Structures are given as structure tokens and as C-alpha cells.
Write a protein that binds this ligand. Structure first.
Ligand SMILES: O=C(O)COc1cccc(CNC(=O)Nc2nnc(-c3ccco3)o2)c1
Length: 288
């Protein structure tokens, strides 16, 4: 049943790091501007736990300077208010985030010229962060998705090279293990889960922005190309709403897109369903 869930987009980058928090309703195609982040942020990740939206890491860059963010903030849709939470052990720009058992996992990202392979876990009910096992690879601009309590970190940049590799995190054993490498090198790709596959849409391969999209079926352990998006894009927002994948904005190598595309896995098609109120990349996106 359709209960009215919305797609939230937080922060992002256009001309500088943005504060913006907006919600889109796929049912009527309307947008609603909500309370601003207390601190502008691009390259952050967004996620939802217990009906609350969380903005994680990222960075604030403008003429007033460049500062990587270790912050965690919690937005309550019911009160339309942001609340500061406990910060991570380190600033994490171009971070990847995933949720398991109501816990927020902050993966990789960077702080200055430091490229994190480290990972830490946040427990809402205790407002406390905890270091877990580090990834086998240093990854900033990594994409993250979770399927059946297993977390996947896809692609990114290790400081020297851009990766087509990916790895899986086993939360209860607290380990990481490499999985099949993608067909394409991708950093800043949109990564999400839909049914039994992890999608890796767009990204930057080191020379061009990508509009190609491939998915990893956890059952067959293979990476498969599906239909390409209309726009190439890296640093795109991505989420799933009522069985379909939605990609928001990103950079196509020329413009900061306002375009929103929707992927229908049954017909293996993407189509443009709306536009953001303004183009932007590096947003955090989540559904509730
Ligand atoms: O590193 C990559 O290959 C892809 O770049 C990514 C990856 C993941 C998220 C993002 C979000 N983009 C982003 O934060 N862009 C941005 N942030 N600060 C700036 C900026 C530009 C000039 C001064 O500051 O541009 C980019």
C-alpha cells in the first residue's frame, strides 16, 4: 500500500556546499523545502533509522574555507528540526553509509590527504560511535548498500587509483572480504539495493563521467550491465522508492544536473520524472 513516503535530499554542492533539505513526493510530483542543515555540506551521506533522517560526514567548502566534516545530525520529519548528534572519530568527506540493525555504518571517506579504509558504527539509542574492522581497501567516494544484513562498499578512490573493486562487510563476524570486481572503474557512483542486486550507477572512471549502470546479483556473484541513464553523472544521489530506483542530480562533466531519473527494473528503462529545484551534486538522499 502507498502510505505517502517521501524522498529527502540533504546538502549537496553547487557553487559551494549547500544546506538545503527538500522532500519530493513521487505520487504528485511536488517538492517541499524543509529546515536547513545547521552547517552546509557536500559529499555527505544520508540514511534513515527509526523514522529519523541522518546527515553523515561530508564537507563544507566555500570562499569561507574548506573543512571536512565528522558531524552527524538527525532530522525529525515530524518536528521539522535538526539536532546535533555525537561526532565520528574522524572527518569523513565523500563518505559511504549503510544501515544494519538500526545502526549507522560510516565507511571510508577522507580527511585532508588521508584516505580512510577505517569504518565506524553509530548506535542511535546510545548516541555513541564505535570503530569496527577497516576495509581491505582505502575508499573515498565509495558507494554503500545493505542486503540481508551484509554491507557492500563499491568502488571509490584509494588515494592513488580509482577502483572497480568492491568488498562485503559481515557485521557479526566484523570482517571484510573482497567480492567480484565491477566491469567499470567507478568513483562517486550511486549505489543502492533493489531486490537481490546491488546497483552501481554512473560515477567517475578517472577520465569521464559515466551514464552506464551495472548490478551485482548476490546469488550469482556477477556484475551485469543494465540500461544506461540518460545523463552521465558522478556524485549523484540515489535511493529506492516503491520498487524503483531514483537518481538525483550529480555532475555530468559540464553541468550540475537538476535531473531526476527513475529506473523500472521490470522494463529495464530509465525515464526523467522530475527536476530538483536547482542542480547539484554530492547530496545525501534517503526515503521515509
Ligand atoms: O572523488 C570522485 O571521484 C567523485 O567525487 C565525488 C564523490 C562522492 C561525492 C562527491 C560530492 N561532490 C562534491 O562534494 N563536490 C565538491 N565539493 N566541494 C567542491 C568544491 C569545488 C571547488 C571547491 O570545492 O566540489 C564527489
Amino acid at each position: 500500500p502507498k502510505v505517502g513516503r517521501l524522498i529527502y535530499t540533504a546538502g549537496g554542492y553547487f557553487r559551494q556546499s549547500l544546506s538545503y533539505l527538500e522532500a519530493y513526493n513521487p505520487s504528485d510530483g511536488t517538492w517541499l523545502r524543509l529546515a536547513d542543515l545547521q552547517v552546509p555540506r557536500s559529499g555527505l551521506a544520508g540514511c534513515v533509522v527509526g523514522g529519523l533522517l541522518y546527515a553523515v560526514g561530508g564537507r563544507n567548502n566555500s570562499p569561507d574555507g574548506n573543512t571536512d566534516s565528522s558531524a552527524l545530525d538527525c532530522y525529525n520529519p515530524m518536528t521539522n528540526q535538526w539536532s546535533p548528534c555525537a561526532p565520528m572519530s574522524v572527518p569523513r568527506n565523500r563518505i559511504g553509509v549503510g544501515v544494519i540493525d538500526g545502526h549507522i555504518y560510516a565507511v571510508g571517506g577522507s580527511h585532508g590527504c588521508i584516505h580512510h579504509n577505517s569504518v565506524e558504527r553509530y548506535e542511535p539509542e546510545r548516541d555513541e560511535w564505535h570503530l569496527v574492522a577497516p576495509m581491505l581497501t582505502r575508499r573515498i567516494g565509495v558507494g554503500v548498500a545493505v542486503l540481508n544484513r551484509l554491507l557492500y562498499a563499491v568502488g571509490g578512490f584509494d588515494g592513488t587509483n580509482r577502483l572497480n573493486s568492491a568488498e562485503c562487510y559481515y557485521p557479526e563476524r566484523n570482517e571484510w572480504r573482497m567480492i567480484t570486481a565491477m566491469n567499470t572503474i567507478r568513483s562517486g557512483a550511486g549505489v543502492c539495493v533493489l531486490h537481490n542486486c546491488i546497483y552501481a550507477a554512473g560515477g567517475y572512471d578517472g577520465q569521464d563521467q559515466l551514464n552506464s549502470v551495472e548490478r551485482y546479483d548476490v546469488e550469482t556473484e556477477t556484475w551485469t550491465f543494465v540500461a544506461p541513464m540518460k545523463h552521465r553523472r558522478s556524485a549523484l544521489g540515489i535511493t529506492v522508492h516503491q520498487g524503483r530506483i531514483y537518481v538525483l542530480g550529480g555532475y555530468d562533466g559540464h553541468t550540475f544536473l537538476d535531473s531526476v531519473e527513475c529506473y523500472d527494473p521490470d522494463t529495464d528503462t530509465w525515464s526523467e520524472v522530475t527536476r530538483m529545484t536547482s542542480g547539484r551534486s554530492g547530496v545525501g538522499v534517503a526515503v521515509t
